[PDB]
Design a protein around this ligand. Structure first.
Ligand SMILES: [Mg+2]
Ligand SMILES: [Mg+2]
Ligand SMILES: [Mg+2]
Ligand SMILES: [Mg+2]
Ligand SMILES: [Mg+2]
Ligand SMILES: [Mg+2]
Ligand SMILES: [Mg+2]
Ligand SMILES: [Mg+2]
Ligand SMILES: [Mg+2]
Ligand SMILES: [Mg+2]
Ligand SMILES: [Mg+2]
Ligand SMILES: [Mg+2]
Ligand SMILES: [Mg+2]
Ligand SMILES: [Mg+2]
Ligand SMILES: [Mg+2]
Ligand SMILES: [Mg+2]
Ligand SMILES: [Mg+2]
Ligand SMILES: [Mg+2]
Ligand SMILES: [Mg+2]
Ligand SMILES: [Mg+2]
Ligand SMILES: [Mg+2]
Ligand SMILES: [Mg+2]
Ligand SMILES: [Mg+2]
Lengths: 135, 155, 204, 141
RNA sequence: CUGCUGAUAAGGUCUUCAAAA
RNA sequence: CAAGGAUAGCACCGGUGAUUGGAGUUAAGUCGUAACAAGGUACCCCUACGAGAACGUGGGGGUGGAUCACC
RNA sequence: AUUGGGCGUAAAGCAAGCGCAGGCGGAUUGAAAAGUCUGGUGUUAAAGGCAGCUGCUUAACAGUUGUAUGCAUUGGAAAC
RNA sequence: CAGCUAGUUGGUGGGGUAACGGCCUACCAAGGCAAUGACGUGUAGCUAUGCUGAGAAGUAGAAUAGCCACAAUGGGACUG
RNA sequence: GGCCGUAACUAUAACGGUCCUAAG
């Protein structure tokens, strides 16, 4: 614009928002305060399992779960696999992600690390799904 | 040995009374790697005829390029529409720091070491126009001496 | 640590170890890209990235080099004075096991590397075990003595077929090297300088 | 010399002359006139020395209260000028001061840079020779 | 020479390629 | 001199709350057809009133309006 | 977007005016020297960065020498 | 977040402090800061530096080094 | 002022039909 104008009101940079906000909130549980500490992957507990319908083009039944994390946020998370052992009450370990079909879902469940069982009957790209090597 | 290389092969189409007429358009850059380079864009129902016509146009329109020590003499900005391409001289050894249409133009022209940056749009025809404008607007250090009555680029 | 299908890799890239021993073979004289999908169309018009990657792979497989080592050597050479197209070639060719090959005391480059790792090779005034030491022309790289009596020493001492840039003083196996290899001694397997530009982009 | 039209000038002395020169170059006009200031006189003297203009000529009124400078551009036989472009650096408001270490080189030495360090306006090469720098007025190439 | 005259379920092909003769 | 205790009223911030307002997202729901052609009453902007709803009408303002037309 | 962007139709000229403070501002002379340029001095800890070398089988790494930036003071320059 | 500040601003005598000082005291005055951002709210140890960038600079203040503050929370003091 | 039917889980009826009155 003008040197004087920028001297008076400098350039303000646009803010940046995260894609997985619920993974960066930590609850102290003694003082009951929530602080912004970044964490890659976080443990939660599921409340309701079921299926959703993909948005416009896709047509299927995709497995979701309403999981409440170690903090006080409840998120809808897609279970990445064919078949699951979720029983409406279990402990899962969510990581970042974004399924395009289901709106509102912005997290995935790591398979075969904790209570949730791994994905057997898989020999290709198994290291992502948590499957023991056939050997 | 006028080498040629294909820069873009688009699939353009028009609509008629029922159906679509589809034609391939090719953007070819022809250069002898010694100072002569041209560009040609052509459209045809098939790729071979499109390439033939594009090569014919490129050979019909050839421009003369002058090099200094294998590079460009002075920093320049070529403008063509919304595409602005910045060229900057480089010392011998850096090689071609160009990518895409600019890289094709520079290699086929014959330059060895050039710094380049596409500051605007990324449409190959307009980038090529900007690059050609930048190289054509260049001033040799003998034309300026003739103009200003200096002594053949002496201090 | 190296591949065990040098035939497959030579058939893919098209360039062998400058002798065509892995191309002539004893069967079928195959000079096609491996796999079932070898005799198909779409041969030329390799992208710039594709041809740069192919040339880089040929270069860093001709000597048995890990890409990380390649980045390390390039970062080493890049800062000095200026256009080092005459220096980085010496840098790439100065490998110890490579010098053993051009000395002629091993049938193959990786066999020479195995001997170097096993410790049948000496140096100017010390001993060397790692097959990556950067050498400089002038060091008396004298071969071991207890390795001259091993059941496989014949082709080793048959070094009369030697490169002119490694001088042995034949029958003495002194094996020094002066008059650094030229682009003539670095054949057309990889003779290009925009792999330098590719590593300039991908390595600061 | 006699004139007929009124003569006006901008408040900014470097960019007034630059606008006049650039417009004359683009329109193929040869002779132009403007109000005379000593900065403009010195800058035109160095332009004439460097060979970007044919002549510059100052004139004074009969009452010695007004001075105007008229200069002509140097066109070749085929009528294309020696000036290719002008760009002003030290505009009003934002004044550009550069030491010797950062004295610019315009178009790899083809053009000239006008620098008014301490001894009036001064070309880039002679400023480098004298090892001293200062205010940078305009780029002319 | 001016009456009236409203609506049409969802997802979708179709360019394979110029290396060249 | 003074940490702390008791009492008391203001100041700022946070969570939650029956009930309630709107919003976004939703492959195949109901009612109309407001807008895009002169969209069948040209459209759009401000404003006031009214109506199931898109919206209708009055006041002012624009062409970012179709036809028209001149030898 | 200071270097390095825009505001007729794409986001963006306040409905228009009178305007304090601020920003910018005609020509010439003199003084001082607050900005500007330059010389000397003090300092900007060590480690880190870059260049050279030595030692670890070479490297990573360790060590060693050189290597800026700003501030203050003092001495000059006077074009803006 | 548009007013904030009553030891707050200034003067006289005395006391106290290693020292100057509303640091404290008694007397006399109403001043001090603030749109060039006081005050309020939120957040944070600062720096040499790490990572990134062609550069201007963006970002974190790992390890280590300089300085500051703390030792369950809040006060007081002896020795020196 | 009434009565009847009506929306792709149920529920309800934005909507439609009709009788009467001076107007519901
Ligand atoms: Mg028809
Ligand atoms: Mg009808
Ligand atoms: Mg309907
Ligand atoms: Mg309508
Ligand atoms: Mg209408
Ligand atoms: Mg109704
Ligand atoms: Mg009405
Ligand atoms: Mg109206
Ligand atoms: Mg009416
Ligand atoms: Mg823009
Ligand atoms: Mg607009
Ligand atoms: Mg207006
Ligand atoms: Mg407006
Ligand atoms: Mg006015
Ligand atoms: Mg004023
Ligand atoms: Mg003036
Ligand atoms: Mg230091
Ligand atoms: Mg070190
Ligand atoms: Mg950048
Ligand atoms: Mg630290
Ligand atoms: Mg720490
Ligand atoms: Mg504790
Ligand atoms: Mg004591």
């Amino acid at each position: 614009a003008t040197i004087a104008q920028l001297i008076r009101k400098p350039r303000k940079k646009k803010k940046v928002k995260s894609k997985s906000p619920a993974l960066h909130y930590n609850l102290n549980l003694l003082n009951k305060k929530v602080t912004n500490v970044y964490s890659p992957l976080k443990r939660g507990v599921c409340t309701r399992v079921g299926t959703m319908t993909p948005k416009k083009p896709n047509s299927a039944l995709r497995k979701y779960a309403k999981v409440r994390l170690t903090n006080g946020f409840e998120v809808l998370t897609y279970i990445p696999g064919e078949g699951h052992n979720l029983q409406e009450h279990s402990v899962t370990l969510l990581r970042g992600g974004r399924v395009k079909d289901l709106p509102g879902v912005r997290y995935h469940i790591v398979r075969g690390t904790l209570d949730t069982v791994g994905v057997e009957k898989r020999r290709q790209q198994r290291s992502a799904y948590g499957a023991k090597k056939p050997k | 040995e006028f080498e040629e290389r294909i820069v873009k092969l688009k699939r353009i189409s028009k609509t008629t009374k029922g159906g679509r007429n589809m034609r391939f358009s090719v953007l070819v850059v022809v250069g002898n790697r010694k100072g002569k380079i041209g560009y040609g864009i052509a459209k045809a129902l098939e790729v071979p005829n499109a390439i033939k016509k594009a090569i014919k146009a490129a050979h019909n329109s050839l421009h003369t390029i002058e090099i200094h020590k294998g590079s460009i003499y002075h920093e320049v900005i070529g403008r063509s529409g919304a595409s602005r391409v910045l060229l900057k001289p480089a010392p011998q050894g850096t090689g071609i720091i160009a990518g895409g249409a600019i890289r094709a133009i520079i290699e086929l022209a014959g330059y060895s070491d050039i710094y380049t940056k596409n500051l605007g749009r990324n449409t190959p025809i307009n980038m090529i126009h900007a690059t050609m404008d930048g190289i054509l607007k260049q001033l040799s250090p003998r034309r300026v001496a003739i103009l200003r009555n200096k002594n053949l680029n002496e201090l | 640590k190296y591949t065990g299908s040098i035939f497959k890799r030579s058939r893919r890239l098209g360039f062998s170890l400058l002798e065509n021993n892995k191309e002539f073979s004893k069967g079928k004289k195959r000079k096609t890209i491996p796999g079932q999908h070898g005799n198909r169309f779409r041969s030329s018009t390799m992208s710039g990235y594709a041809q740069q990657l192919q040339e880089k792979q040929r270069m860093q497989y001709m000597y048995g080099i890990t890409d990380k080592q390649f980045r390390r050597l390039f970062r080493l050479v890049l800062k000095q004075r200026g256009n080092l197209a005459v220096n980085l070639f010496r840098v790439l060719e100065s490998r110890l096991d490579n010098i053993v090959y051009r000395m002629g005391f091993a049938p193959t480059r990786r066999s020479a590397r195995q001997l170097v790792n096993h410790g049948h090779v000496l140096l100017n005034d010390r001993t060397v075990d790692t097959p990556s030491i950067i050498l400089n022309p002038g060091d008396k790289v004298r071969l071991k003595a207890k390795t001259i009596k091993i059941p496989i020493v014949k082709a080793a001492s048959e070094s009369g077929v030697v490169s002119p840039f490694v001088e042995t003083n034949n029958k003495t196996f002194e094996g020094t090297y002066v008059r650094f290899p030229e682009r003539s001694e670095l054949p057309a397997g990889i003779n290009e300088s925009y792999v330098v530009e590719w590593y300039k982009r991908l390595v600061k | 010399i006699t004139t007929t039209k009124p003569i006006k000038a901008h408040f900014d002395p470097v960019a007034d002359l630059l606008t006049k020169i650039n417009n004359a170059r683009k329109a193929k006009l040869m002779t132009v006139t403007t109000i005379a200031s000593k900065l403009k006189i010195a800058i035109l003297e160095i332009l004439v020395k460097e060979g970007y203009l044919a002549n510059f000529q100052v004139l004074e009124n009969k009452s010695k209260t007004k001075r105007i400078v008229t200069f002509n551009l140097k066109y070749t036989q085929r009528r294309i000028p020696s000036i290719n472009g002008v760009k002003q650096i030290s505009k009003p408001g934002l004044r550009i001061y550069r030491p010797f270490e950062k004295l610019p080189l315009v178009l790899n030495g083809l053009g000239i840079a006008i620098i008014s360090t301490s001894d009036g306006v001064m070309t880039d090469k002679v400023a480098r020779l004298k090892k001293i720098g200062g205010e940078i007025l305009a780029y002319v190439w």
